[PDB]
PDB file of C-alpha atoms in Angstrom:
ATOM      1  CA  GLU K 125      66.616 -50.047 -27.672  1.00 11.79           C
ATOM      2  CA  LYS K 126      66.861 -49.778 -24.281  1.00 11.95           C
ATOM      3  CA  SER K 127      69.377 -51.214 -23.998  1.00  9.11           C
ATOM      4  CA  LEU K 128      71.260 -48.678 -26.208  1.00  6.19           C
ATOM      5  CA  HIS K 129      70.084 -45.909 -24.638  1.00  7.19           C
ATOM      6  CA  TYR K 130      71.461 -47.263 -20.753  1.00 11.01           C
ATOM      7  CA  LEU K 131      74.687 -47.819 -22.603  1.00 11.95           C
ATOM      8  CA  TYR K 132      74.832 -44.105 -23.955  1.00  9.43           C
ATOM      9  CA  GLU K 133      73.217 -42.372 -20.379  1.00  8.31           C
ATOM     10  CA  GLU K 134      75.859 -44.822 -18.641  1.00  8.44           C
ATOM     11  CA  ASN K 135      78.500 -43.628 -21.263  1.00 11.52           C
ATOM     12  CA  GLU K 136      78.256 -39.657 -21.288  1.00 11.29           C
ATOM     13  CA  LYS K 137      78.476 -40.481 -16.743  1.00 12.03           C
ATOM     14  CA  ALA K 138      81.754 -42.153 -17.568  1.00  7.66           C
ATOM     15  CA  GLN K 139      83.199 -38.829 -19.901  1.00  6.63           C
ATOM     16  CA  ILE K 140      81.495 -36.509 -17.353  1.00  6.51           C
ATOM     17  CA  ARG K 141      83.254 -38.360 -14.235  1.00  7.41           C
ATOM     18  CA  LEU K 142      86.015 -38.484 -15.954  1.00  3.05           C
ATOM     19  CA  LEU K 143      86.124 -35.079 -17.108  1.00  2.00           C
ATOM     20  CA  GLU K 144      85.020 -33.930 -13.071  1.00  2.00           C
ATOM     21  CA  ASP K 145      87.874 -36.082 -11.769  1.00  2.02           C
ATOM     22  CA  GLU K 146      90.010 -33.759 -14.151  1.00  2.41           C
ATOM     23  CA  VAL K 147      88.529 -30.613 -13.319  1.00  2.36           C
ATOM     24  CA  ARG K 148      88.949 -31.595  -9.529  1.00  2.67           C
ATOM     25  CA  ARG K 149      92.736 -32.588  -9.854  1.00  2.00           C
ATOM     26  CA  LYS K 150      93.789 -29.242 -12.246  1.00  2.00           C
ATOM     27  CA  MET K 151      91.744 -27.634  -9.262  1.00  2.00           C
ATOM     28  CA  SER K 152      93.626 -29.285  -7.007  1.00  2.00           C
ATOM     29  CA  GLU K 153      96.905 -28.457  -7.987  1.00  2.00           C
ATOM     30  CA  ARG K 154      97.321 -24.761  -8.558  1.00  2.00           C
ATOM     31  CA  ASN K 155      94.491 -24.781  -5.601  1.00  2.00           C
ATOM     32  CA  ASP K 156      92.203 -21.777  -7.536  1.00  2.00           C
ATOM     33  CA  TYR K 157      88.768 -21.929  -7.361  1.00  2.00           C
ATOM     34  CA  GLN K 158      86.719 -21.012  -4.381  1.00  2.00           C
ATOM     35  CA  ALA K 159      84.836 -24.132  -3.461  1.00  2.00           C
ATOM     36  CA  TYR K 160      87.336 -27.173  -3.170  1.00  2.00           C
ATOM     37  CA  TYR K 161      90.837 -26.907  -2.511  1.00  2.00           C
ATOM     38  CA  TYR K 162      90.881 -24.048  -0.947  1.00  2.00           C
ATOM     39  CA  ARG K 163      91.477 -23.360   2.625  1.00  2.00           C
ATOM     40  CA  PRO K 164      89.698 -19.209   3.303  1.00  2.00           C
ATOM     41  CA  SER K 165      92.481 -16.803   5.190  1.00  2.00           C
ATOM     42  CA  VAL K 166      90.380 -14.138   6.005  1.00  2.00           C
ATOM     43  CA  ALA K 167      91.675 -10.957   7.532  1.00  2.00           C
ATOM     44  CA  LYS K 168      88.471  -9.263   8.697  1.00  2.00           C
ATOM     45  CA  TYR K 169      89.837  -9.825  12.662  1.00  2.00           C
ATOM     46  CA  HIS K 170      93.050  -8.005  11.179  1.00  2.00           C
ATOM     47  CA  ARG K 171      90.752  -4.799  10.017  1.00  2.00           C
ATOM     48  CA  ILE K 172      88.849  -5.160  12.876  1.00  2.00           C
ATOM     49  CA  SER K 173      92.005  -4.582  14.899  1.00  2.00           C
ATOM     50  CA  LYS K 174      93.735  -2.071  12.867  1.00  2.00           C
ATOM     51  CA  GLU K 175      90.221   0.234  13.126  1.00  2.00           C
ATOM     52  CA  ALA K 176      90.246  -0.581  17.165  1.00  2.00           C
ATOM     53  CA  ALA K 177      93.695   0.988  17.425  1.00  2.00           C
ATOM     54  CA  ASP K 178      92.846   3.961  15.024  1.00  2.00           C
ATOM     55  CA  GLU K 179      89.666   4.237  16.493  1.00  2.00           C
ATOM     56  CA  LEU K 180      91.820   4.891  20.512  1.00  2.00           C
ATOM     57  CA  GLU K 181      93.995   7.318  18.903  1.00  2.00           C
ATOM     58  CA  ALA K 182      91.048  10.307  19.059  1.00  2.00           C
ATOM     59  CA  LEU K 183      90.073   8.094  22.665  1.00  2.00           C
ATOM     60  CA  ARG K 184      93.503   9.616  23.562  1.00  2.00           C
ATOM     61  CA  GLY K 185      93.491  12.784  25.949  1.00  2.00           C
ATOM     62  CA  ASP K 186      92.502  14.395  29.170  1.00  2.00           C
TER      63      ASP K 186
ATOM     64  CA  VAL F   2      43.852 -81.548  -6.153  1.00  2.00           C
ATOM     65  CA  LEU F   3      46.203 -78.464  -4.598  1.00  2.00           C
ATOM     66  CA  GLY F   4      45.141 -78.094  -0.442  1.00  2.00           C
ATOM     67  CA  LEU F   5      44.695 -74.325   0.602  1.00  2.00           C
ATOM     68  CA  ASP F   6      43.509 -73.301   3.403  1.00  2.00           C
ATOM     69  CA  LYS F   7      42.479 -70.136   4.946  1.00  2.00           C
ATOM     70  CA  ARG F   8      45.892 -69.198   5.273  1.00  2.00           C
ATOM     71  CA  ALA F   9      46.376 -68.929   1.128  1.00  2.00           C
ATOM     72  CA  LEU F  10      44.733 -65.641   1.424  1.00  2.00           C
ATOM     73  CA  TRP F  11      47.729 -64.265   3.232  1.00  2.00           C
ATOM     74  CA  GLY F  12      49.621 -64.393  -0.286  1.00  2.00           C
ATOM     75  CA  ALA F  13      47.793 -61.570  -1.969  1.00  2.00           C
ATOM     76  CA  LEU F  14      50.679 -59.736  -0.347  1.00  2.00           C
ATOM     77  CA  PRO F  15      53.716 -60.975  -2.350  1.00  2.00           C
ATOM     78  CA  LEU F  16      51.125 -60.712  -5.013  1.00  2.00           C
ATOM     79  CA  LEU F  17      51.028 -57.044  -4.571  1.00  2.00           C
ATOM     80  CA  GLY F  18      54.626 -56.875  -3.781  1.00  2.00           C
ATOM     81  CA  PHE F  19      55.030 -58.610  -7.986  1.00  2.00           C
ATOM     82  CA  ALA F  20      52.101 -55.511  -9.065  1.00  2.00           C
ATOM     83  CA  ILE F  21      54.426 -52.945  -7.768  1.00  2.00           C
ATOM     84  CA  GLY F  22      57.135 -54.802  -9.877  1.00  2.00           C
ATOM     85  CA  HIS F  23      55.773 -55.111 -12.462  1.00  2.00           C
ATOM     86  CA  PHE F  24      53.432 -51.170 -12.564  1.00  2.00           C
ATOM     87  CA  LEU F  25      58.144 -50.103 -11.603  1.00  2.00           C
ATOM     88  CA  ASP F  26      59.225 -52.078 -14.594  1.00  2.00           C
ATOM     89  CA  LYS F  27      56.337 -50.431 -17.128  1.00  2.00           C
ATOM     90  CA  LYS F  28      57.287 -47.094 -15.580  1.00  2.00           C
ATOM     91  CA  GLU F  29      61.057 -47.675 -16.418  1.00  2.00           C
ATOM     92  CA  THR F  30      60.368 -49.428 -20.106  1.00  2.00           C
ATOM     93  CA  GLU F  31      57.951 -46.504 -19.959  1.00  2.00           C
ATOM     94  CA  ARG F  32      60.818 -43.320 -19.546  1.00  2.00           C
ATOM     95  CA  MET F  33      63.638 -45.666 -21.249  1.00  2.00           C
ATOM     96  CA  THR F  34      62.428 -44.422 -25.003  1.00  2.00           C
ATOM     97  CA  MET F  35      64.736 -41.899 -26.407  1.00  2.00           C
ATOM     98  CA  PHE F  36      66.437 -44.640 -28.782  1.00  2.00           C
ATOM     99  CA  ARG F  37      62.918 -46.068 -29.674  1.00  2.00           C
ATOM    100  CA  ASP F  38      62.531 -46.016 -33.146  1.00  2.00           C
ATOM    101  CA  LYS F  39      65.591 -44.066 -33.831  1.00  2.00           C
ATOM    102  CA  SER F  40      68.577 -46.727 -34.039  1.00  2.00           C
ATOM    103  CA  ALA F  41      70.068 -47.783 -37.879  1.00  2.00           C
ATOM    104  CA  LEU F  42      68.753 -51.572 -36.902  1.00  2.00           C
ATOM    105  CA  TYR F  43      65.172 -51.087 -36.446  1.00  2.00           C
ATOM    106  CA  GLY F  44      65.028 -47.961 -37.568  1.00  2.00           C
ATOM    107  CA  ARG F  45      61.842 -46.292 -39.448  1.00  2.00           C
ATOM    108  CA  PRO F  46      61.806 -43.609 -42.493  1.00  2.00           C
ATOM    109  CA  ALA F  47      60.158 -40.231 -42.413  1.00  2.00           C
ATOM    110  CA  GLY F  48      57.050 -39.854 -40.874  1.00  2.00           C
ATOM    111  CA  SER F  49      57.344 -41.597 -36.729  1.00  2.00           C
ATOM    112  CA  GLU F  50      55.583 -39.543 -35.275  1.00  2.00           C
ATOM    113  CA  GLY F  51      52.580 -40.496 -37.170  1.00  2.00           C
ATOM    114  CA  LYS F  52      53.108 -44.039 -37.167  1.00  2.00           C
ATOM    115  CA  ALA F  53      52.376 -46.093 -33.642  1.00  2.00           C
ATOM    116  CA  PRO F  54      55.825 -46.931 -31.134  1.00  2.00           C
ATOM    117  CA  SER F  55      56.716 -50.780 -31.831  1.00  2.00           C
ATOM    118  CA  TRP F  56      56.612 -50.726 -27.822  1.00  2.00           C
TER     119      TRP F  56
END
């Protein structure tokens, strides 16, 4: 019964390993999810520069 | 008979390691127990919680 329990645990670990390999392959195929296989491109600096350029329109004067 | 000097008192370290390994094996067979008396070969009929475990 100890070998039966260890075989059941190792078999379930094998199925979860195969399923996470499939999930990681489908995630790297499409680059969909935000955890792995995702390059975070941010426009924070573009919005900061646009806000600064909008702020310096008020500063234009004499 | 066998001859053991004062240096044989240093041999309590491998016996302590043997006791530690036996305790870890006892903890491992204590944990590994969800199929205990529930497999279809060594099975038990209804009322298994009243009866003692087999091992």
